[PDB]
Structures are given as structure tokens and as C-alpha cells.
């Protein structure tokens, strides 16, 4: 199936010259823009009415913490082996409880691509990618997040993260 897109009695000839001389056809465009100043602008008041998002929105990373208070990250290295931007370095140790935790964790947020391959690989739901997107910075150093700007970060949005995890866990 194919469709052609672009393929004289005086009545027609006068009609053609009534649409070329007394332009009547650029007028069907002027009335067309006059049809829009009288409509409601779509603009949202930005700072006060932030636009709509979804519980799936991938933004600023954060390290969730078990309700008890125990970091969820068990230093698998299942999240830099997949991070395609090669952004994460999670050097670990036994934490002197005999347990298994990070001494090091890192994202360089100037290399990350917010692909969420780290939140879907984590078998424990430690690293997530929160719904922040107002975290611009005046400097380069404030984007190389450490384990303590991700853990207290996750000690901030956990009321707001878990609702979205619980909201999308089934679909995932």
C-alpha cells in the first residue's frame, strides 16, 4: 500500500487569482494563530508547581538503609561491573563486627548516565536512583558523591523512595 501526497474555467481561474491577489490564504493562518492567544497557556508556574513525574523517575543516587539502621550494601561489586560509564569504586572490608560492608563507595555524577542499571542489579535494594533532579552544583567536586553523601542522601528521601519502590515493585 502506497499513497500519493502531491499528485481552467473562469470560475477556477478567478478563484486562483482571488487567493493570490487579495491574499485570502495567508489569512487562514493569521486566524489560526489568533486561535491560540485566547487559549490557556500550558506553562506551569515552575518553582511552585513542579511538573509531573512517575515513581519510576531516575535521578540522584542514594544508598537505602535497613529499617534497623544497617546499611543494605554488602559490597557485591554487582553494580560497577555493569555501570557502563565506569563510575563506581566500592573497595570493601570486613567491618570488624565480622559483617560485610563497604569502606569505600563512589559515584562520579559527572560520568553517570542515570540508566538505573545499578538499582535493578542490586539484589538487596541498596543503591537506588532517587527522584531528585534539583541538585545542580556550582563546582565539580560536589558531584563526585562518596558513601556518606549517598547514605545520608538515602537517610533523607527514604520516606519518598520506599513509596515509589512499593509502588513499582510488582512491575519489577
Amino acid at each position: 500500500t502506497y499513497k500519493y501526497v502531491n499528485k481552467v474555467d473562469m470560475k477556477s481561474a478567478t478563484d486562483n487569482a482571488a487567493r493570490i491577489l487579495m491574499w485570502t490564504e495567508l489569512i487562514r493562518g493569521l486566524g489560526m494563530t489568533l486561535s491560540y492567544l485566547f487559549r490557556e497557556p500550558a506553562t506551569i508556574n515552575y518553582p511552585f508547581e513542579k511538573g509531573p513525574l512517575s515513581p519510576r523517575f531516575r535521578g540522584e543516587h542514594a544508598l537505602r538503609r535497613y529499617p534497623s539502621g544497617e546499611e543494605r550494601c554488602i559490597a557485591c561489586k554487582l553494580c560497577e561491573a555493569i555501570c557502563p560509564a565506569q563510575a563506581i569504586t566500592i573497595e570493601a572490608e570486613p567491618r570488624a563486627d565480622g559483617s560485610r560492608r563497604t569502606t569505600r563507595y563512589d559515584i562520579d555524577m559527572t560520568k553517570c548516565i542515570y540508566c538505573g542499571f545499578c538499582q535493578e542489579a542490586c539484589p538487596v535494594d541498596a543503591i537506588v536512583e532517587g527522584p531528585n533532579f534539583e541538585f545542580s552544583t556550582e563546582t565539580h567536586e560536589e558531584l563526585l558523591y562518596n558513601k556518606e553523601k549517598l547514605l545520608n542522601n538515602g537517610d533523607k528521601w527514604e520516606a519518598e523512595i520506599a513509596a515509589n519502590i512499593q509502588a513499582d515493585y510488582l512491575y519489577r
Partner: protein, 84 residues
């Protein structure tokens, strides 16, 4: 929601019905918090369902001339709208 005169201004000037097709979402939008879902999930030996191992290494290979494949059937003009 606009004064009828102002909106008839936009319907007459546009030339098209405009209350019907809004570019703004008032109640058209699905509300958030959709009820939680329940996504749908013998002789299931992987050796029978092996896509990866099913493939084979590439085959290497009076008489009448043969085209690569039968010539493409020419299409035909659309029934609903032949010319637009």
C-alpha cells in the same frame, strides 16, 4: 474553561472544533496510584528450549538462472485515501 465568546473566537478563527480536542489535560488524565498489579508469569528442559545453542555455524555452498528471491509484488493505492 473559557468564556464562550473567547472560545468561539478560537473555534471560528481556527475553523475547527476546539472544545473537543484539548491540548490541556483536565480530567482526560489517568489519576496516579493505579491499584497494585499481579503480573502474569514439566518437560521444561532447557535443552529443548535452547535459542542460543539452536543456531548452527554458517552453511558454505541446462541450469536455469535464479533471482535472489521472487520479484517484490508492487503495492497498490490505499483504499481509504488513495491521494492526500
Amino acid at each position: 474553561s473559557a468564556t464562550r465568546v473567547i472560545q468561539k473566537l478560537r473555534n471560528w478563527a481556527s475553523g475547527q472544533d476546539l472544545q473537543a480536542k484539548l491540548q490541556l489535560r483536565y480530567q482526560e488524565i489517568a489519576k496516579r496510584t493505579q491499584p497494585p498489579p499481579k503480573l502474569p508469569v514439566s518437560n521444561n528442559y532447557y535443552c529443548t528450549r535452547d535459542g542460543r545453542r539452536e543456531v548452527v555455524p554458517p552453511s558454505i555452498i541446462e541450469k536455469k538462472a535464479v533471482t535472489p528471491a521472487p520479484p517484490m509484488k508492487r503495492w497498490e493505492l490505499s483504499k481509504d485515501q488513495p491521494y492526500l
